[PDB]
Design a protein around this ligand. Sequence first.
Ligand SMILES: [Zn+2]
Ligand SMILES: [Zn+2]
Lengths: 605, 85, 161
Amino acid sequence: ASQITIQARLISFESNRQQLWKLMADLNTPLINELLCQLGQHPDFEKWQQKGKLPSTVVSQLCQPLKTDPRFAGQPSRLYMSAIHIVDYIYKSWLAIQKRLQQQLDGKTRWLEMLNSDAELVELSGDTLEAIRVKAAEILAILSKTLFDAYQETEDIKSRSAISYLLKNGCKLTDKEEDSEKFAKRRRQVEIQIQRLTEKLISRMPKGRDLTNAKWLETLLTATTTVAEDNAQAKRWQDILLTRSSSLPFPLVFETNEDMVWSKNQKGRLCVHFNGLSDLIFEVYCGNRQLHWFQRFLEDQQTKRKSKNQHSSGLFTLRNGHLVWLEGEGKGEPWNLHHLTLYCCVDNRLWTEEGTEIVRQEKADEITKFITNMKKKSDLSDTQQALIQRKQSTLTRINNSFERPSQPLYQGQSHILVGVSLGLEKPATVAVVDAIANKVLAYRSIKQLLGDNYELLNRQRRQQQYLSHERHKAQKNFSPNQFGASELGQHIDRLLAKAIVALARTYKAGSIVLPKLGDMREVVQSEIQAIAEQKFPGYIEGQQKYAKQYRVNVHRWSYGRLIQSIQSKAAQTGIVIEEGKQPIRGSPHDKAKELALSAYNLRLT
Amino acid sequence: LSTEATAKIVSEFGRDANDTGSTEVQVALLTAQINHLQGHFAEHKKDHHSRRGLLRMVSQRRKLLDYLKRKDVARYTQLIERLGL
Amino acid sequence: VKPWLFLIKPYEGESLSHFLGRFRRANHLSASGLGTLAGIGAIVARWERFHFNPRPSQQELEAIASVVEVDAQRLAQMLPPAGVGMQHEPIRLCGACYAESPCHRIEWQYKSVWKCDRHQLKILAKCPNCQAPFKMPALWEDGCCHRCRMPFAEMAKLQKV
RNA sequence: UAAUAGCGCCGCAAUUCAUGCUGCUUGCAGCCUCUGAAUUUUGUUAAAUGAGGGUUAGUUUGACUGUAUAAAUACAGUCUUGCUUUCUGACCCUGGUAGCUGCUCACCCUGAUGCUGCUGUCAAUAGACAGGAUAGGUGCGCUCCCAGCAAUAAGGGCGCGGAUG
Ligand SMILES: [Zn+2]
Ligand SMILES: [Zn+2]
């Protein structure tokens, strides 16, 4: 999995774009809105929320009677498919971030029940804490998942108290019979995490997009002309009147690569037309850096044509493509203001012939497993047999190789690992360490990786404060000049990713190790709240202003973006990314060294 | 709101010679401003700095109407009929 | 001998704010001091101005009960009963009921109360002689308007019937 | 006249190290010459930072083939398209005319993450004219400090009218 998106503007006539804008902003986005609303009020909805899997076909079932509707009719089939796919993905996400949140809440409740002090454990067990300690050592002799299973499995007060004592230290036997206030703060922190997860689980339903803003305009008339009767209704009117009038239709996900048919203009320019809309021809305006992808698209489609469809589109360097509208600055009709943009998702691994072989092996394994899975059932539907036929068709067609560039992949020395330490102040720090002999081959810092570019790092912090102030000075004036250094941060993290992967290449690394951070901006919020609740007992504003800057620094600390960028570059290059635990205490260099060493140690089994 | 308009609306919602600030007059002023602003909001859909003002005027008029309703329902009804709210 | 405080017996229908103010003035305490003694922090200083954004909890009232030595149910009997809406501002007073007993009634702060049921008088929201809004009930060192020094019991004959 | 003091950032030093340099003694010895790392430690006659607003389908970072090259990388050949961003420059400006509309002010006091702060000329009014990014303070900025204003933070005071459930 090394999917990356390239983009290109699409240029055509004013009418060719009026057709698309009318056909999406007026018929496709309303279809997505109605599909979302219907998905919400479906009777099985609360069942889906219990799982993370919305059923495979439900969204299409609510769409089949919707295609013939008076206000949703007059669309290509592969665009009803776009709407179905968008809504299905929205609710495939929304049922996976609420199921895992519920799992976290359940686990945190179990841990809150787990947590007892030394005195509390003594009074519950009815024995001296020394017996608790001895039995806890005994049970540690007989990871944490096993202990939680043991606790949830037994009903004895003594054994369960032993589990509690063990997991209080984290499968450790610490004999420092002190710091009861520390336990009080820890229990307070766990309770705050419980409260925050509960506050999260009451989430808004997927909104959808209202381009017409009919509700806004109607509510303005209701609020001005009439008078509300209670506060709870005037508040709803106010909330509606302040909502954001979105003005961009949903994209068009074309999950089939061939739905975009490519051609060469009489001027040599590349051109696209999509399945269902062939009278609409769009001319590709890319940049030369992205030219080879589009030329590969045209060459691959022509190569499939010239073999009488003996070649499997499915090894195409194109996987799918969104067809979005950007936002333009100025005035005029929307088709003349917003720039149509094609976002093609390409499997970079397929560019080389050698990587194409890897992709071929992956697909030929997964799809023959699919064939075996369908061959056990005896239902033998007709379209099910059509699917079975297509699977063997892809099997047969996959062994016909297109002519692609050749690069002998990347032979990686398994010993030499790369450990990356992230931090609030040192965004990254890399240690190239050989595992056979623990001596680090090399160290680099945030000034070494950003060489000649290190000035950016300071300029990121110098102005992200400045912009943070400028926004504040413009909000009170209600000017739209709210700017932020998100692009600068993204550029800096991309530079770091390139530097780290280049360093791994130079020393012939066999892996890259990144820490598993977990919920990092939440644990610090909980800890700061717990500390401020004693530092400020009854003053909530004081509990908030306490460690404000530290918390906002954590929240804007983009560990996830940096990890994703490094993962993208390593996958593009072939470095096998692993994971480890960042040591809690230590210098960044030692942190990275021990991180990579631990990753190597755990990998061995 | 223009001074001439305020004087005219005070006189035309007047209860006597000197009643500026009577709940009827305050509701009349707020209603006049909101009625002028609704067209501006039909046209300029980006002027949020006026959106906050509109919300404030709506809430002020709502409070005034509730107060006058609790005090004197008769005056409340005749007022809400005069303004057609 | 046993640890003690200048205990005050609560009135009938007195406010939590006014009762805490009388408790403080009879103990020469401060809102921060009373909160620290009770163990709930500056929450007390909030209650003196009726900001019950997070309704006074059972724990936050048991902790007070430990200090002022008044039963927790008797404490809840000066907050509005569950579901009843009160206005934290303006502070309202009936002159006759103050002349009868020098306290501030929580029932005066209800959204639904405009008349004294045992006096048939429209209760006062501001001083009837100088139009000065009344302070927080806990801040009533004595029964007089701060700006005009008019006794609270006097205002009974200025407030309308 | 004032910007004291604090905080952050750069540099300049000084020290100790190596991820450096040297040496083979190949993991040890020294050294701080470069490169860096960690402190503290000053703001030099200065080093480096540097935040008033804008303007290019801008340039470069590109693909394939072959050679040397293990490879990077270089060279040679063929092709080239304008996407979205980050800098560095250069240049322009410090806006006008119309409308529609929001907020804030009886009058005080304190004073906010409040506003303002450039050069010259004419005034020395409160404003024009020319210029102009060096633009109050410290090497550079701040929500910090100075100066003026402060109704448009918040709080308190407080006059007369209307309302006063
Ligand atoms: Zn009474
Ligand atoms: Zn008075």
